[PDB]
């Protein structure tokens, strides 16, 4: 079986550098060019460059020369993107491709802001369908998962330093609080899980 | 550097309409043009390569044509599943430049928002802050006005709005309006009102609470 | 006497030399995957019209192997639909996939399909010289990589999958391709059958009859090519279940008399043609239908 696996999400400060990996299993890459594509938050796709793993012949968009370095190794069937002089402009998803097949992307966040555990505040109405929610404040970097064990997830806004997001749920008023519902908030960077029971 | 000018940037369509996207190459790129579909949160997937050849598994509604500079992408009849951003790319010369993209909006019937207001939680005022959050769920179209009232006044400062992408199921929008202020400001005032104006109604949808109760 | 003017023309019919493995069953090399020895196809020529009949089944062998909750018997022999999807892949998808490789992008469709299958790494074992075979379909222009490289399981003892290689009418646009299929098979390997031609041996400035021939009825050329295929070089005997490698030795050739409807089959390499207007010259490798 053929698989494409990109390295994990990276949080880095400005002025630094990063090596992203793209591991192909079950397939010899030498015959196939391998491309890296950049996509900034809510923006378009940008071709960084590609490598011919046979010659190690790599080319670039002139915009990325001296910022992007694309390498490949046919004995490990792996491609790499090295990014120099990191900058908020470099905050993006980075896709690797095995020819015309695309990876799942690697999220890069470039910021001097440090990793912060989220605090969660329950949203209950004041004293047929009933709407509840959780307000997720004071977390960094971007990436919070919220599940309820009707459902809306509202994009995070950069609230003067940290991130502020929210989620809502709409359940029958006969099902609450007859059988109480909970929101669980996962933040993988801080490695924290928090369960808040609505009352 | 070959520029690929993709038109239009934004395209609203009803489920069943024809979608026509055009991509103009600044130099000759022969037949080497691919078309991609990127649905929300996913990797782009290839639909058409060499300008006109449909990839296996790609629905017959999707078609591409053109040679030289003038390339066109057609969805014969757009369906609900087709909600995505679409890109041309040329592969004939390096850099292999993408078009700027075309983001589709699924056009549908008008729907009034379900507004709900929420008091700042007690375990947030212990932290030293108070955020009044208001959800406006399941509305269309996207044009919505939200005005906050504090004891009947007009609150502009400390308001942050957040829209969602069109829903995967019902093609509706949802947004949260949050009034962020200090627990000292919140304790001083009593009435907090969430007022929502939409084109579906002339009188705005009002949803408020008193801190007194 | 005359020197042989058929020499260059007849080179592609030296199946022992140009193909060098079994035809009906091709398992002429061994290779290890993860500490385990396997037999695999190693023939240098495409086998036109060959596929696998699964016995007691309606499912075609080009169907992906059973995976997930599927039982072995409901699937076929092909690579399963995982992503990125390497099989099945059309000619143009393959050309596009390899577009930045000057050699590979310019290969003919059969060699391209064979090289594409050869890029699959079995169990991701880079120590392995094992490479999967493939079947190319002319109608759809599809390369199907085969996960199952076995070609025959015909043991009456329990005849799990029971199956045999065949040139079925529904396989006419198929070509069976081992990892070893050569770049220049068009110059060096058989394809179309030869009208107005009968294989013979060059003896004293003349093309003489093949001295030893077995004769069977065949209503048309396709039936004759099938019979030759059934008797051809084979790296396992029928109904079984090293000296088991044929190296392309077998009953690989047939002279078809279109008028008496006789298929004349032999196991010695031909060195000339007799021009007899009743005859078509066929090979186990050759297309079952096409004539030149």
């Amino acid at each position: 079986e053929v698989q494409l696996q990109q390295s994990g999400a990276e949080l880095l400060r400005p002025g630094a550098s990063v090596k992203l990996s793209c591991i192909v299993s079950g397939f010899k890459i030498k015959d196939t060019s391998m491309h890296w594509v950049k996509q900034r938050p809510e923006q378009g796709l940008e071709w960084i460059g590609r490598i011919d793993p046979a010659n190690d012949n790599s080319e670039y968009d002139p915009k990325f020369q001296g910022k992007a370095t694309i390498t490949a190794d046919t004995s490990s069937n792996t491609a790499y993107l090295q990014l120099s002089s990191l900058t908020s402009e470099d905050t993006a998803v980075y896709y690797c491709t095995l020819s015309h097949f695309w990876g799942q992307g690697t999220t890069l966040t470039v910021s001097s802001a440090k990793t912060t555990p989220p605090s969660v505040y329950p949203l209950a109405p004041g004293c047929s369908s009933v709407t509840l929610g959780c307000l997720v404040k004071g977390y960094f970097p971007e990436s919070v998962t919220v599940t309820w064990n009707s459902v809306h997830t509202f994009p995070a806004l950069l609230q003067s330093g940290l991130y502020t997001m929210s989620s809502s749920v709409t359940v029958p008023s006969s099902t609450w609080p007859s059988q109480t519902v909970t929101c669980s908030v996962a933040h993988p960077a801080s490695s924290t899980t928090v369960d808040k029971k609505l009352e | 550097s070959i520029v690929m000018t993709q038109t239009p940037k934004f395209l609203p369509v009803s489920a069943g309409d024809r979608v026509t996207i055009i991509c103009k190459a600044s130099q000759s790129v022969s037949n080497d043009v691919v078309w991609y579909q990127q649905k929300p949160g996913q990797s782009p997937k290839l639909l058409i390569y060499y300008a006109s050849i449909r990839y296996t598994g790609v629905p017959d509604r999707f078609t591409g044509s053109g040679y030289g500079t003038d390339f066109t992408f057609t969805i014969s009849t757009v369906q609900v599943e087709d909600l995505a951003v679409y890109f041309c790319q040329q592969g004939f010369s390096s850099p292999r430049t993408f078009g700027g993209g075309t983001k589709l909006e699924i056009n549908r019937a008008d729907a009034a928002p379900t507004v709900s207001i929420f008091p700042p939680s007690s375990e947030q005022l212990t932290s030293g802050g108070a955020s009044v959050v208001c959800f406006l769920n399941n509305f269309y179209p996207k044009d919505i006005n939200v005005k906050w009232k504090i004891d009947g006044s007009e609150r502009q400062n400390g308001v942050l709005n957040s829209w969602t992408d069109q829903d995967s199921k019902d093609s509706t929008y949802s947004m949260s309006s949050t009034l962020t202020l200090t627990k000292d400001e919140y304790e001083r005032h009593n009435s907090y009102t969430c007022e929502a104006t939409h084109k579906t109604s002339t009188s705005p949808i009002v949803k408020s609470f008193n801190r007194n109760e | 006497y005359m020197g042989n003017p058929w020499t260059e023309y007849m080179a592609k019919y030296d199946i022992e030399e140009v193909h060098g493995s079994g035809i009906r069953v091709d398992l002429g090399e061994d290779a290890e995957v993860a500490g385990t020895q396997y037999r695999l196809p190693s023939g240098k020529c495409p086998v036109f019209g060959k596929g696998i009949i699964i016995e007691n089944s309606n499912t075609t062998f080009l169907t992906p192997v059973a995976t997930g909750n599927q039982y072995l018997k409901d699937g076929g022999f092909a690579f399963p639909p995982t992503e990125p999807l390497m099989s099945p892949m059309t000619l143009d998808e393959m050309r596009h996939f390899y577009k930045d490789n000057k050699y590979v992008k310019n290969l003919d469709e059969l060699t391209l399909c064979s090289r594409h299958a050869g890029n699959m790494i079995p169990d991701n074992d880079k120590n392995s010289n094992y490479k999967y075979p493939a079947v190319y379909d002319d109608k759809d222009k599809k390369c199907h990589i085969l996960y199952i490289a076995a070609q025959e399981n015909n043991g009456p003892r329990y005849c799990m999958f029971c199956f045999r290689p065949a040139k079925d009418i529904s396989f006419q646009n198929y070509t069976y391709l081992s990892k070893n299929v050569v770049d220049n098979w068009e110059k060096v390997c058989p394809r179309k059958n030869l009208q107005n031609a009968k294989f013979g041996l060059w003896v004293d400035g003349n093309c003489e009859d093949i001295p030893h021939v077995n004769e069977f009825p065949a209503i048309d050329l396709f039936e004759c090519n099938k019979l030759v295929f059934e008797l051809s070089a084979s790296d396992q005997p029928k109904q079984y279940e090293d000296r088991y490698k044929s190296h392309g030795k077998g009953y690989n050739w047939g002279n078809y008399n279109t008028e008496t409807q006789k298929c004349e089959i032999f196991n010695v390499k031909p060195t000339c043609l007799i021009n007899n207007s009743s005859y078509i010259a066929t090979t186990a490798l050759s297309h079952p239908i096409e004539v030149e």
Side-chain angles (χ1 to χ4, degrees), chain A residues 39 47 100 102-103 131 152 155, chain B residues 36 38 43 55 96 118 162 174:
Chain A
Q39 189 168 42
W47 195 75
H100 66 227
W102 292 51
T131 310
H152 290 96
Chain B
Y36 284 101
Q38 187 177 27
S43 305
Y55 211 91
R96 315 211 175 161
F118 294 93
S162 186
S174 293

Side-chain angles (χ1 to χ4, degrees), chain C residues 178-186 188-213:
Chain C
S178 90
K179 56 156 203 135
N180 279 351
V181 162
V182 294
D183 272 347
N184 62 346
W185 66 261
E186 298 178 52
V188 294
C189 295
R191 191 189 196 288
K192 293 186 195 191
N193 306 289
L194 310 163
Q195 306 174 296
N196 285 322
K198 193 190 184 190
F199 289 134
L201 298 176
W202 195 256
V203 183
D204 302 328
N206 219 257
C207 200
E208 243 38 280
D209 272 326
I210 309 289
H212 177 250
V213 139

Side-chain angles (χ1 to χ4, degrees), chain A residues 92-110:
Chain A
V93 183
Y94 292 84
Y95 295 99
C96 78
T97 78
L98 177 65
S99 182
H100 66 227
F101 296 119
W102 292 51
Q104 289 292 282
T106 292
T107 303
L108 176 71
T109 312
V110 180

Side-chain angles (χ1 to χ4, degrees), chain A residues 35 37 39 43-47 50 59-62 95 99-105 120-126 131-135 137 150-158 164 166-168 170, chain B residues 1 36 38 41-46 55 87 89 94-100 114 116-121 123-124 131 133 135-138 160-165 167 172-176 178 180 209 213:
Chain A
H35 307 245
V37 180
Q39 189 168 42
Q43 288 161 236
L45 300 163
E46 301 169 47
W47 195 75
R50 83 184 161 91
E59 48 185 11
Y60 303 94
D61 186 300
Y95 295 99
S99 182
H100 66 227
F101 296 119
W102 292 51
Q104 289 292 282
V120 186
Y121 313 110
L123 313 174
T131 310
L132 294 166
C134 290
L135 183 63
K137 255 185 157 288
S150 62
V151 184
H152 290 96
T153 305
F154 304 97
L157 297 159
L158 199 54
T164 302
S166 33
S167 189
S168 73
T170 300
Chain B
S1 308
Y36 284 101
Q38 187 177 27
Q42 297 178 33
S43 305
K45 76 202 98 192
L46 173 74
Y55 211 91
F87 299 94
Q89 196 198 5
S94 174
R96 315 211 175 161
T97 44
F98 287 91
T114 304
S116 62
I117 194 158
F118 294 93
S121 193
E123 55 267 65
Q124 193 195 4
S131 297
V133 53
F135 296 135
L136 326 192
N137 297 351
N138 309 302
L160 286 166
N161 294 334
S162 186
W163 277 264
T164 62
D165 297 332
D167 195 88
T172 56
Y173 292 95
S174 293
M175 68 100 72
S176 69
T178 302
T180 312
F209 79 90
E213 280 86 77

